[PDB]
Amino acid sequence: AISGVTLEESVRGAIDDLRMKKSRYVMMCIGADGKKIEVTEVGERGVNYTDLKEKFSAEKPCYVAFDFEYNDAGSKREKLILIQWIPDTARPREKMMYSASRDALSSVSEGYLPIQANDESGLDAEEIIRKVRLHRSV
Amino acid sequence: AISGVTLEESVRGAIDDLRMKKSRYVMMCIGADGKKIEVTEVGERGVNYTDLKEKFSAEKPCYVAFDFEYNDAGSKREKLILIQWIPDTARPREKMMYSASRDALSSVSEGYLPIQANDESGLDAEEIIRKVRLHRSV
Amino acid sequence: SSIVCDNGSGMVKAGFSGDDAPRHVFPSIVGRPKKTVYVGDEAQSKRGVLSLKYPIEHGIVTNWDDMEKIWHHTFYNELRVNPEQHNVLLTEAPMNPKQNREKMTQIMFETFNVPSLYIGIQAVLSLYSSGRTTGIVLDAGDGVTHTVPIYEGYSLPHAVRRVDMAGRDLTEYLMKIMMETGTTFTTTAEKEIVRNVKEQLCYVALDFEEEMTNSAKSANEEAFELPDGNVMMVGNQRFRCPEVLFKPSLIGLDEAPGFPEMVYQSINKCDIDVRRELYGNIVLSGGSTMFLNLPERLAKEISNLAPSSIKPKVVAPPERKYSVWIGGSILSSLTTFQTMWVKKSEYDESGPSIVHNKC
Amino acid sequence: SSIVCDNGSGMVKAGFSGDDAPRHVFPSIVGRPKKTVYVGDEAQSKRGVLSLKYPIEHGIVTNWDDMEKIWHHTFYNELRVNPEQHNVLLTEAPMNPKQNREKMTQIMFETFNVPSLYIGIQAVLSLYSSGRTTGIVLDAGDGVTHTVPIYEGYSLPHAVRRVDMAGRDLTEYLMKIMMETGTTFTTTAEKEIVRNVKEQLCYVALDFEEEMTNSAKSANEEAFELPDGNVMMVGNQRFRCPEVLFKPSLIGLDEAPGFPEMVYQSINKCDIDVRRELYGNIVLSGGSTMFLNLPERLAKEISNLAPSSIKPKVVAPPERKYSVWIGGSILSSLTTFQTMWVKKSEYDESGPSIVHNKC
Amino acid sequence: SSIVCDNGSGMVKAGFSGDDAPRHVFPSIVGRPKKTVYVGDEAQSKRGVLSLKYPIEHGIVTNWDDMEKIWHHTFYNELRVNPEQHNVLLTEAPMNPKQNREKMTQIMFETFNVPSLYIGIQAVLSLYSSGRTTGIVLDAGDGVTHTVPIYEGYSLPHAVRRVDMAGRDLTEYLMKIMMETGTTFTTTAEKEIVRNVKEQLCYVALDFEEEMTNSAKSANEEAFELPDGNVMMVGNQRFRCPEVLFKPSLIGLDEAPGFPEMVYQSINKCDIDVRRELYGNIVLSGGSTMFLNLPERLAKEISNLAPSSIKPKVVAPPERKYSVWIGGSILSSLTTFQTMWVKKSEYDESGPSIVHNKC
């Protein structure tokens, strides 16, 4: 990343647990001193996507890694996605810092589908379902 | 044309004959009553451009349609040009009448390259050769 | 037969079609007390106790209320004809807004009840009378000057320029520099005297620097006769006055380009393949171009700016003083022109939009 | 702390990192007599008797000899700081040749002895400050305009376009059409007055044809105060000037596409599967985009060209006037950014090639 | 005598049989207002205010309605002959669907009433004029390029390829990279100027990497004269433009193979025992192959891909620019060829199927 931030040591371990179906989602945010990205909240597999959608705050950007299931015609298909949530109402300093720090997660988020959202209309399930199906040959 | 003159019925037929290589040149002038443009003289293909250049009169403007050949590096290329000859020594009434009547020939002289000359130096072969080559892409 | 009127900017030219020169020339000024109003030479005679305004200055109409008096004076006092029994041909300056054209035809049809009307273009009429179709026209009036490039009978709207510096400012500059030899010319009575000196004695010097140095050694002067009978002597001011046209910085106009630069900058605003043809068809017009040796000097100045592969040519017809009016007079005298007029009945059934489509 | 400089094309923005807005804005011009040379506002005040040249016009450096004077003026006369005691961040235009980048860093290290240097990309910095990573950036300056599509933080070199028609030409067009109401603005003193009218009164009309017809009936005008104290009236020229951006044929540019067509043609030069994402992330930037109601008009125009299955979205942040400088200022204020600078010792042991690998 | 016409993709070649070179060359474009329609150089002159479409692009007819105007222009405006009194020979691109061939002969017999018609193959005519019967033909036009292997006078339908990247894209790439030295060439008037620079100054560099590094040290430039008389300087763009042919990734075409790879992949699609003969009979054709030093560079590139037991040979006849037309002209001038024409009476009694059996 051009901003110069790095990843906390616990971030890499949390992603592997998410891959092995040990959790539903992991939320990451920049630390108080603004030097590293640290894990904030981890959710269990009981929760669904609809409950997490209500946890997004219009004043605080965050990075969310989620295991999304869309039930394609009676198939329990799941896809790993990485949501970049930067609302337009955030402070100018916060928007610049989070946008330039997206490159840090690229070294550990291999296989995750990057999704960019800047407003509540971009978090719609139909929007996500359309994007995941585009990159699948089958 | 803003002057209000029109073309004689024989003018259109003479131009088509010139296009089909049935003649060398056709000279057109305004009639005695000054209401229409009528054909004056038609030359056969035996004559060349040099002989016609000596037929221009310093006291009488005229419109000349000619099939000009320039022999571009051993190529028998020919180009259809329309010469507007209005000498500066003509009467003030004649210069105004001929200049404003040039628009009449536009409806029948499609494909002809318009060339404007007001003195004997503008009738030079090199001047004509330079202009015809400018508009040819090849 | 018909009436041909050239409003101009300083003077109005009027007459009948078929003539070789206009018969009525008078300044376009309106006077009011310091008769309720005075128009033309009437205000000129009483210029001492009247305030003068120009309805048309710089080539564009500024006040239609005072402009109608100019036309009313021409028809009745000057031409002495009924406006409702003749055909009138008018001219308009380049880059004229359509609002002025619509109002110009409205006045003629509704106020003067003109049966047939036609509006021409000053640049086009001047170019056609020179036996040409493509070229660039340099018009030098008194309140404004233009450069209008014309290609195949259609002007290019994106290469028209104005300087608003012409023969009117030359008279003031000549009057100011005449005080060096004593006396004064503040009053308007002596202002007309200065104008006559400009039009009879002034000439353009080929080499400005050489003439200035050798004039002092010669100290040659010429005699001019005043109306009172006294004789006035004019020295080196003869060739200093026209030099303002080439270098307009002498009157505080540093940004003004002058004649040689105005032509060069106007040509380069056109298409690259058309510039070569425009350089060889420079046509002079206007009363301010009548100075002696002006065409010879102008050709040399432009040649320096142009590249070595371009040889400009300057055309100066002897009758360039009234090119606009002469061209309009000849056109209206044609027998076939009777189908080009705009009838009053067409205006009634179509409105002011008829002039835009026609003409 | 550090120094952030945005050369631009018409004006130079400079300041210190951490500020919310630049403190020093001055035009980038060099003047010489018709002090040997004058730079910035010094040449602007004496513009009457000086010839002006632009070291950087259309976004690309043309003369390095006159460009060094711009930087020397900024450090000493404007910022009043020692160049050898601060870190300097510079920006470059899109599609900048590597020769300019190599010469840009050579001057800073060898002439000004800058300890640490860093060069950014104007399009990237503007996009990041909007909280986005993929999108298309429409930059409208004064001497040039660009459309740079960016995907995942990397621009696409094969979809970048230039028009070289921006706010500078709007001032000239407004000045030319202001002569219809009389007066003139030839001198450079009145040129600055015309610019102030553009930035305070001009606005974009949603329906161009409807406004033109109804303006004549209303004949509404607004008052503007001249420095001399006189009051000037401005009519329908307020909304006619910005219309050149959408239809550039009014200034003789028939081939120029305009804003709605420039975006459409740039998107279609990219991959088919990426076009849909680019349509929804159109970001406005530059000072020429500050006209009122511009974003609303632009969205409608693009929607007509796009197919019925695409719904474009336009993003216009309030601080889009200085997006490039604000983004650079925020980035340099980060505590972790200290490891991104290029030290002078690295240049000595590696040469000019260090900038290509880094940054 | 007879008429030989080569439609091509960008330009049309026409003339009479027996000549050593075509006399009429004009682009195949159709223009309409932004005369109802303009064809050929008529639309080229008024290109500013006209929209241009290509009836034949990429070598295959796309619109028959606009294609008939191309032939009508050639017969009457260009050749000035009656179509019903001469024999016409036409050529078709490789892999041409039979529907186009059936419609091509229908138009000539029914609309132009051509007495005798004959249709040839561009690849076959080009190969025969080189004194060969077996080989591979590399045709490089402007809108398309082909590689047609021919064995014993019959082409192989399963080894024909298209890239749709030829000299037309080279002009656009040269125009884009010319902005680095300032100025611009957006308008169509300057587009023709860029084409002339390509055909007079551009050349192929034997070693691309070596020339780029040493060009900066030399900084050598050449002078080109504009129509206006100004002189333009061209630097390293002379050898950068033709390099796109060998590596088409510079214009965003990553998947395109380029000239050396196109030949290699086409040969390997043929029988194993015939590949050795094809390597030694590579024949160049088309106007895009006229760049200096092109054949020398092409031979080296193919040799690297070929195995060590194969030594390719490249044949570049001097008259390769008009190989298709010259070959057709020579064939029609033969005395014994009079029995090969297709008479109009045969079409009446057999229908469109006659052309498939004959020719």
Ligand SMILES: Nc1ncnc2c1ncn2[C@@H]1O[C@H](COP(=O)(O)OP(=O)(O)O)[C@@H](O)[C@H]1O
């Ligand atoms: N012989 C002359 N020499 C120099 N200037 C002249 C001459 N005759 C007239 N003028 C000038 O020309 C000006 C007006 O000329 P003209 O262009 O015909 O009228 P307008 O300027 O109204 O179009 C007058 O102000 C006068 O000073």
Ligand SMILES: Nc1ncnc2c1ncn2[C@@H]1O[C@H](COP(=O)(O)OP(=O)(O)O)[C@@H](O)[C@H]1O
């Ligand atoms: N409020 C405004 N409205 C319209 N135009 C503006 C406004 N402010 C500045 N401009 C124009 O923006 C141009 C320069 O803007 P900017 O893009 O910031 O600099 P540069 O063009 O050098 O990058 C100026 O020429 C000015 O005319």
Ligand SMILES: Nc1ncnc2c1ncn2[C@@H]1O[C@H](COP(=O)(O)OP(=O)(O)O)[C@@H](O)[C@H]1O
């Ligand atoms: N001397 C030359 N050098 C390089 N390219 C040329 C030269 N002459 C013509 N061309 C290019 O060849 C193209 C057309 O050539 P040609 O193949 O004969 O026509 P077509 O492509 O229609 O078959 C033109 O676009 C032109 O740019």
Ligand SMILES: [Mg+2]
């Ligand atoms: Mg006049």
Ligand SMILES: [Mg+2]
């Ligand atoms: Mg900028």
Ligand SMILES: [Mg+2]
């Ligand atoms: Mg071909």
